[model samples]
Target chain A: LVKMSHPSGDVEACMVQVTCGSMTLNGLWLDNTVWCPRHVMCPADQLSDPNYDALLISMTNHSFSVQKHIGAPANLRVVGHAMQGTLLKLTVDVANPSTPAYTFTTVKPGAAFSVLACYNGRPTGTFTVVMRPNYTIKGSFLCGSCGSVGYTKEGSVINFCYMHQMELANGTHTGSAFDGTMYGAFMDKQVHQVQLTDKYCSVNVVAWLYAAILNGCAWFVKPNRTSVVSFNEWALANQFTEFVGTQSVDMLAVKTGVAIEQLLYAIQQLYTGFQGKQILGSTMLEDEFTPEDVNMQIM
Target chain B: GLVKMSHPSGDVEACMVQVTCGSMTLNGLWLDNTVWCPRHVMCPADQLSDPNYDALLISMTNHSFSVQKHIGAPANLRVVGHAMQGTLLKLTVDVANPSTPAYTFTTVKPGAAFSVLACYNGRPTGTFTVVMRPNYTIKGSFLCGSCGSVGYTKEGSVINFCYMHQMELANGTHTGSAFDGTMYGAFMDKQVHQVQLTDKYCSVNVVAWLYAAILNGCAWFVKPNRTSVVSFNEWALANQFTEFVGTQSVDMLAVKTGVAIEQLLYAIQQLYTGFQGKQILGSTMLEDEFTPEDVNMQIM
Candidate 1:
């Protein structure tokens, strides 16, 4: 728990500590009003010290937000536990305010490292950071796991869904009941990250998942394309949400007349080939590493 | 009356409370076996103000609020302002708790400028302003309508949202979330639940009991319009009140607000009262000087 006064004439003078990790947006812990904790690694005394002024100042502002001004990212050392990887710590200097560089040292010694980074520019989709010895990833603005570890340029617009997929995975949302909490933040005109409350999150999730499956059935995952999305006579029979799966799967099945099962198959062929599960049909789990330069798109 | 018996398994059964809330006498329910029982209570779809507007959920524990300690009983006073000493009216002191604001009264219709002597404890204390609005639907409380909110919209817009001070555990028990908050005060008929307290809770004064409950209300209620009644500076150090909060602390707020040690203690004392009280469960009051390290290392 914490204590304070005058922070606001309306808000509280104290806050109880929570076990859930602080939700991150562009590397900076959303410590202000987010229902999460601060740097979990910081000692309780340091965490509760009234002089601990890390949450006050902005990146480079003079706004009188708190008693003292502490540069964010420079001192925001906590990332809660969800995105804490298997190991984590974050601190960035404000020389120019580019995306904070987070390196994963324990994803193994010889494993090919990858992470998702989104760019809202013209192409506006998720991208990967493939580095030497280790890969540096952007803050929560963009992410991996939902798809592949490569450029998503030829793919559909990848801004909203990727952000929520990351958030839904992070929040303490249990089960299928929708938790309508949305988050949107931008660092500059072109730099941003967002987490749509499950309310609007599915709009993008369904759209992107369908787009990827459509493209794969026609081009990307060619060899297994027919098997992934087979059409006996072309009278419906969609396998989209079924494979993408969740409670929305069956509901989407009844609503669409087809499915989430084929969705799982297609998404697997879509991303697994990307997550390296088959990498075009190769067996694995921390086994070997591979990536080939693709000559372009079916978009 | 035990409303319903719910069982997650054969070994345990939860006797749901007898709750006759909502438009229908027998409320509805949905059961799922997920350990994470995400739940909520609200009006049916038709009752929403707007069919498409997504807004904040009412605190899950709002059903248990019973605020009245501060909002004094309604009384009849003379409407001696706007050049009229003849008009007498019946109104309540719709002010804030832990507030020093002049006595303000709720109104039904718009009118001319009026003035009244704000009194408390039998003395004229402050002043009040009676502004009128054309909208009858909002039913503007003395402080303001649905506390202000900051929304990060497509163009950064404003809506009526307040910092959440209260939250409910899975079992429906109310818990404080924010320590700093404000809202219009008169709550004669309102029920703002209290954060469990004790005899040695704050100080042995009526003020401590009052302050402790103020933060308790602050935990879940909206902040007021004119000002917040929660001032840590209002009380002396030894007399400050607080309760046990598992996560948030006065330290964070003090770092941001520049509150003195006294105010910190005062704002944070009301919480944790339950935490310590239960763990110790002592027949005697704790000594003023005691350390968690020492207590944990030695005697009970």
Candidate 2:
């Protein structure tokens, strides 16, 4: 028997009603008022036991209406590949360094996602794509940089320049087999020329023809230059046109400060190599290529 | 085997004195003797596994003078032979109505010798004596005209004037028994005034010496300034006849005068001391003596 009707007694307004009927006295209608003379003058004798069969009535109010059991709360489920069932949106394709797929988005019931579970491409698993109550899509993953050096294995193809030399080494080169002028003319003739100069016939005809014409136009460019000229800016405009035919202004200011400090240390290792990146474009890798199936290439 | 000796409540064990000799036994009628005992005893070692008597007649031996004659010790164990004396010597004094400062002493005799003298008007101020023996108990606390230690020794003959006040009578001499500050100024002038004294048993014996001088002169004027002089509003308005205020009530008969603020300020200061005829030592306050020969000529 519970009954706590709020008066700041708030135990969730207690209210347990199941006191099997029986009331009518004085006017004398007692077919079986269950021993009721006003229930023997209000006697459950303090919650029963003056020799009783049962009685668990309670009262000393602090808010009650009792009928609570509640259970059911622990359901987290994030299995494999960009969370499968009820996938709502997932589209991770990372346009193939070789084969990438990722995908993960759905989550409805209570919604939540931050899905990071890449491999062969960095990010190693940690899912929280929620949304249930029939809207499905739980989560899980950890394709941990799939193969190493910034990722590449779990089904290959993600060499965004070796994932930028294993996660952002910055010497820039998104892909086309990066030959930034054969790695900037072998890093400007092995780490900035000036090998041995002090004027031996003006350092062998002007510092070996001025590092062989500024590292031969930073490795094969000058075919009448202008393929939008980049091999180290066309080897600094062909070493300023071979230093106006060898006019050595103090060896061209010490070879332009060792070629701009080896082109700013390869543009700061390609800008810390696109830190954990994925900006696949080239027509999203020829629209995600897939034609090699002639019976699985004749097995 | 055969020996007997007994004593109870007869005291005598000041380390048992002398008894150390051993070895002797005989059987025909009985005789045995040995010594070196006293690490309490242990005897039976297979006399044919004898339970009670099989063949034994032995007398004392020594391990400090054996004395285990059938080992009996059930009634107040040991010490039965002689020595128990010292009689009556009780002193009690728990006075209150006589000016207090401090005094408490107690005693009971077992090895008697007594001493406790504290006279004032006649002279002797302090003295002490001890040794009442038998499980001894002696405590003496004192304080009267400044000395050391004496608060209240709680046991039998009480006497704790620690919260001092012991007036039985005073001034015209009876210096109310003991606690004294001039028997607390005549129990604070008969607790303020009995119609200034028209007898109701001498105003209930001067208000029982003004409730034993305000509980033993404020337990000795509250132990030294105890943070500053107390009570005194003209002695609480001359002991409560009341009227000593600056702004605590009574002033408007349009500023003053219910008999000109009570009897025209003592008759205009006795008419300016009789128009300067000058004779105001306390203007006309009298009733002096109360007796122990006027408290030995009013306290030294």
Candidate 3:
């Protein structure tokens, strides 16, 4: 559950300040445009300055602004408990200049609300507020159980998929999506489902997933002629309509009711099962690291 | 009576001479773009050399004259006497000569003004003889009889009246005119008299005469006004007269009189130049000249 505080007050006073280690969450924090846990690590003194407030908000691409008591919140608050699949109502109160208050009720994803008023000489009219669920990924998911022990962590997760097949052939499926034959078969089923329905994926989600997949695939292999040929073949086989992959990791997570990282973990298991085995086959047969063998694997 | 002479020889005569009294008219005579009367006053040994012809007519004026005989009768022929108030017998001859015998003759009159010419073969061997009366009368009725008489007969006829004053007072007239009449006056006079009278007056006043005469007086009167008082007086008088005098004769007389008076004033003022009483008299006269009464009389 996410706990939020009114932006004009201390999180300690209004709600629980979710603290990680020594950093306490007072305002929305971000790495680039995406929310990141390290936002809480932003210096306390820097957060107090109004200039820093603008920098923080601009860093988030204006999606959210969080600061100490001096900086105003976006003024949005949850009106009541929200459940999945329910319509929500939200209010943007522009009556106060310093701290505008917003009241939100559970609303369907992509549904809009119009709030009308004339406050502060600005014409208040229908503002089609698009309601989407606030979703975030935790670092723990990246560190947990996707591939070989250390390979599934942040910065190394992209390569984990490449080595997962090798690890599974040894009968050591620990820290990988192919923990059991049933798990491996489940991932195969998901891949088949994606291939069947990927035609319906929206352009934006397909594009994002295509990029992530390409990044993971390239990280798994070294840059060389044979590796380039294998990557291109694997990419083409899984290509969706107008996208390079058969599945959107984001869509898969939503449909399966799992985290996107878990879906990515599944994709890694699927890619390694066949394509990864072929890429490593020549190298395993040679049983020695010769330039040609190395080239076959690295490429 | 005018004397006439006949050549002594026939058409083939190597030398022949013809003569007439008064002046023998020559047509189409030119001297520097001006028509000149090549009135042959005496005979000479050679006719071709301009110096011989020139010496014959040199006493009349310095202008060079040349003559060419045309086919028609001479357009003009006049004879007037040599004296004032005599029975001035006049005669005109318009005759054609197939063998135009060049002649010279001596005047029976008092003045030895005469010319003679002798032609040897077909060409003249010597200059022709012609005698011109020192004075001749030009008579014409005034356009407006404002002067004492409508009929004006000056004793000596100039090319025009503009030359009359200078010829009378200075013994000779200047070459130019107040207007652009200059050399054109004599030609204009001949045309005017020919058009007006047919054969009436020996000479007539042309348009150039009127302009020249009036402008001559204007030039003369205008000169002394370079002095301040006279200039003021002249300007005042001129401003008072809106138009010129109605009659030319009257205009001429008024200009003449005004010039005479200005001259007298200048003479008197000069007489008083160094004396205090003279200065007072000069100033008083200057003031008097500009007054309306004086201006009216002076302008008239």
Candidate 4:
């Protein structure tokens, strides 16, 4: 009953699991496969039922759990590329324009928010939510410099100069290729993940908690470099550089304009209020990737 | 965004539109950049499926009610009937044949927000939004000697939120369920015309006013300033331990106690809406709710 994307690229049927307090419940993934594999099934209720209301739903490459089910059944349906597993160490793909992601900013900061990324520049079929929080206050990407990102389906290789301070037009290499979406994080240039200390955000909630700081910068933080998006205008033009993550949590905590206790309290509430999303940098399945895989990709 | 419209001939056909999204200052203060300027591109019906210009239907999937009220547009659209971009973005619909309502597009009843994203080649080119002027109305404005009170209306409908809190108890945790702010909200909701706010209740009551103000449009509620915060505090300190009585009108009391009771009245009038169920910074503002009314009753 589960549908999710795997780094391995094999489309497998997944099972949805929900933990209601002390009890762990099971169901089939509602819509995880490209072709409707309806027949290869079990006897449990589909995810659309009441049991799916408050539980851990393993779909795509990632899994989700909620405290309450306040929206319709369709809103729970996964729309973009989700990981088969959660990454413990936050990974940044320097080469891929859509590798890193950004956080959501409210005009008035909320209790929690989201970190987002897309593929190429097209949000249609190619958009990918690189990373997001397990809490509410989840937001959407309005516009950004993701147009200069994504993989090369139209061309042999993608030219992602947009990663290194390249705007969408002047330095942007726009072609009539089948480029539609992209994903990545904020940076002045394409940078890789370099962890010097164990203090790096390691917990699942912590990673998102850290994302909250970045989003605070974007939320009510400032202007756009794009001509299409004029400065001080109400709109948030898709623009980011490395300056967002330059500070430490102590520094960022002050900079975000929110009290540090509020950030910690929000993450604690997420873990206490919800059912799943405990571990980070690891996968729900056994050998999704090795600890060595991250090092191999990095060093 | 995709659209299938029923023409005057009673037949449904495809439509196309041009959407531009970015934030604009709707009120004096610039809030979230939501659904903005939208223009529909019209073509002859004969040309709808002629070359078959393709447009797809898209929106946020799996958005729950809890998420909707906090983040996206708090309303639905044609059947699936949902948009949550007012808290902002990530919804897109591609269309052809006269799109963009130019604000001629109307909002659904009980819904105050809507959004659209412009897309090409399976990617978003831009976005658009609109927050309908709330069609809500309130009644029985309260003014107790210049210290006053207002009312509430949510989305396009009048909200009788007062009924929800009438049964709450004002006592503390020792004798009952602790002060969660619900009781004070109920108290204020009941006596909208009696507009003096004690120090602590003023803080909690401000929270109560939040949802009422946002849904009804921020203009409906009186904005609180520093003086408003101070008045509630000083009035309480002034009457800290005296056998106070109604022999003094709250206006006379404020003058005798050396506090601006008018601001407190206005603040109470402002906060009459109360924090219903929404939370700010995970705080229900309960400490500000319970004890003050019980402790500050000398003034009342």
Candidate 5:
């Protein structure tokens, strides 16, 4: 989960400090009209005495700051017991009592959330929240009585929908709703060195499943197309590049559409490929890793 | 003036009439919304057996003749200087009066001259008429004398001052008040741009004196540039822009500081030069018909 902290004073004058456990990982200064901590991945020592003031005020009064904390779990407690489908209230006094308050809500382990801020006990501002779940795929085992490996066991036993047309078992199922809420977990792993065809097929299935969910269509598994699989992989990579290059454009579309199906598919396919799914037509996850040469031509 | 005969209610249209000073020409005639009196009679139409002499025949819902003045003209005959004070009498007869004739008077021109004497009868004889006292004419112009480019066209009339100071009186902007009399003068016989004002805080106080005498067209008036009543600098700079650095400024001051008339004039000239395809830049790609190397090489 992503965490964001802000100072409780004038935005231009405040510097924010963030700590995780006993470690003072780092801190960022408030800039423009917002006093939220900036997100950086450097070590705490490296960032101890950086020129935060100069960088923050470089644009003078022309700059604006928006406090955005994405993919954070709300209404959730990990210590005791599982509590699902609970409304969360977040309280902060960054602005004056008369100014306003911002609130976000979501179910536990689910990305489905609604956010609104209040000013003087009156709701004033709203935003959307997203979250990512964690899970990993263990090696599959055959069903002893059925003479088929359609059902699998990992550590203990969790029954998931068997997808035999594509031989790989479901490692993490990420369900995405039309309201920009994503359900599902993914195993983030690095899949090294594979034949171009198998990679293309794996990536293709991941992207296709996500696209289907977003369009409000039933997810159906189709046999991987050899020539078309590479093309699919190319399309997916291009989308990723385009999204990074023009962050505003991508975010605007995502917010406006309020759909999370595409994201779900991408994460699922990446997980399956990471678990050594080499065959192209075996599973939807196998279609994700299309060849780069095929992608260049499409782009 | 002396009243020879007077009727409180009378109609002058029914009386027999002979106009001496001005011709009895129908200036306008209309039947409803259609007009009927300004067309010329052609030879072919005039030769017809039963010719319609009315220049333009108009279809009408109601028919009536209305006589309006085309232009006011003065009479050649002098009254005060040449004749005795009461020798030439001016009488008005209401032709529409049913019982008695309208008013008659022994009229005299006050200082200059005027005569509204004529005869007509359209009344059935029971109306009263009034004889007026002696009246004369006053002349002047409504103009910005400093800049002849702007002025009014009449006399003995009030001129409104475009005082930028009082704009906030109504709707936070300066709007001039209704016409006010500067002097007690006859409001007649005036022609084209002749009024003047000289009081404290009056914009007309800044007008140049030469415009008060000269009436003929000449380049005596200077072109207007931006000015601020808040700070009094009347001399206009020709080609530069000015900046106002103070806060809590008036609209006029802000407007003048932003873009003066002189700066706008210079910009317009430059724009026109460029539009005519002038190339002030020396690059070959920038060469144009109006400012090619050959034309620009005079200095080079």
Candidate 6:
């Protein structure tokens, strides 16, 4: 007999007995007012009943708890190089609770690795790298202007570059056979240039440029060299030299000399017909001009 | 001058009458399958016979009774007895056509009052009244003289005063009274009608006149006004009595009411047939004076 407590504050006794070589319930009856059966252990026969077969199948498939652990490498490095490609390396630490043992294996090309990189004291982005042939790690950087950056090792030398910057350097030197120290310097320079260029081209700077150009047009036509100097001062203050990699009006002044009046005339002509000319410096038009291409020439 | 021809098939010839009328299609002749006439002519003088006239009167009276039966006594209605006020009556009844039956007993206090209760399966579903109006007419801007005037002029007589009062008896916004500026007037009219007359005056006579007027107006009112009555019945059935009499002896009162339930039912059926006959007889009135007098007294 088993005593069961009910939600209705009723306690009932139920009987269990074995008969015919199977466990069963006998002389177990509930009060007429009890709509629900009291709790009791299922007898052996009831457990083997066909009615519980479905429940058994579901129980077999039911998952109680699930846990997932990502295998992240502890230290990732462009370790070495081969004739075919750069070599990438990942190191992880493991401690066994039973007997401490460690094993190492080569991660082949197409293996994926991810690492978080901190910038300016905060984890700004996650770097996902795929192992490539020639001891290289190829991946994309989520940060602005850090596009298609990767690390490659040749012998003891490791190198990294934005692919576009590498292409600019050698067009066909797409391989990562450069040194990491030089690549880091290049990256810092390029990142700084990008940040400076972005700051210079703000709405206020552009508005000021428009006003300076228009206001200085009359003096410019008189070959008043002071106006060009004044414009150059304004451009330098706004970091325009960093953006275009040129000396602003000083370059124009040198090109035209006292015939800078002709330069001024040309500028006026273009300004008056500005609507007929396509706007430049749009990212959509970036492919039309390479970094070495003539960005803007007063002459 | 006219030419009359009896068609072998009872389908009249086309020559004397072109049966086309309005948008309806009929036989080519007025007398053929052309069920209706297109043109107006004085019905032939000889056709207005005494027998035909008597038959028409009897049909009209019969139709009134038939309509009354169809307009059954408010379902489950039982009048218990009069209150000491003389004008007030007590009654008991259950609302009809409800999913659940609801029985309520209340005094029919004079002057156009109503109460709404809710029921479930012949049991009081809720404790409180859903709605009630002590005097529905008093809520609005109409005056007594105007209501009486409108009743006399528009509805045709002082006998129609109850009809206006009945319109206001439902416990809700009386839009008709609101639109017609007759709310207060209806209340006043009901108040006047509920004023008790001395014992020397017969209540039965007044009641008979009211029933007679109701029957006389039955045909005109049945098509439109009966819609409100049916709506009220449904509302009461679904939402308990908007108006009710107190609990009384159901069988005993039904007997004493003198309207044998079956007779009332048959009377309504006959009255319907009588209305159907009126359509056939057109505007012709029966010449028998006895028919109209007897008809008014009994049929409704």
List runs of model 4 lying over 4 Å from the truth: A1-42, A45-299, B1-14, B17-111, B118-129, B134-300
RMSD of each: 28.3, 54.1, 60.4, 24.3, 36.3, 42.4
lDDT of 6 by residue, B1-300 (tens): 000100010001111111111222111111111111111111123442212323322233211210000111122222221111111111112222221111212322222222111111111111110111233232221211111111111111111111121122332222112212233323321212232211111111222222333343433312211223344334334332322221222223224344322332223323423343242111111111111112231231
Better of 3 and 6 by TM-score: 6
As a whole number from 0 to 100, the lDDT of residue B284 in candidate 4 is 28
Q: In candidate 4, what are the lDDT values of residues B205-232, reduced to their tens digit?
A: 2322232233223333334432444454
Task: Indicate the docking level reached by candidate 5.
Answer: incorrect
Candidate 2 similarity to native, TM-score: 0.10
- Name the weakest run of 10 consecutive residues (lDDT summed) in model 3 chain B: B144-153
Candidate models: Cα lDDT each: 0.21, 0.19, 0.22, 0.21, 0.21, 0.21
> Cα RMSD for candidate 2?
54.1
lDDT of 3 by residue, B163-255 (tens): 110011111111111112222122221111212111111011111122222332423212353223344344434332111112344335435
Ranking by TM-score: 4, 1, 6, 5, 3, 2
> Chain A of candidate 4: what's the TM-score?
0.17
Which digits, one per residue and each the tens of the lDDT, describe model 5 over residues B1-300? 001111101111112122121221211111122221211111132333343323222321111222321211111211111110111112222122231122322222112111111111110111111111111111111111101000111111221111000001111111111112111122211122233221111111111111111111222222344334223223212222112122222223225234333433332334323323222221111111111111111111
Off by over 4 Å in 5: A1-115, A118-221, A225-233, A236-299, B1-300
- Candidate 4, A232: how far from true, in Å? 29
In lDDT terms, how accurate is model 2? 0.19
TM for every model, in the order presented, reads 0.18, 0.10, 0.13, 0.20, 0.13, 0.15
Q: Count the backbone clashes (under 3 Å) in each candidate.
A: 65, 88, 26, 79, 67, 24
Rate residue B45 of model 2 by lDDT: 30
Q: Indicate the residue-level lDDT of B170 in model 3.
A: 16
Q: Which stretches of candidate 2 lie over 4 Å from their true place?
A: A1-299, B1-257, B260-265, B271-300
Residue A25 deviation, candidate 3, in Å? Answer: 99
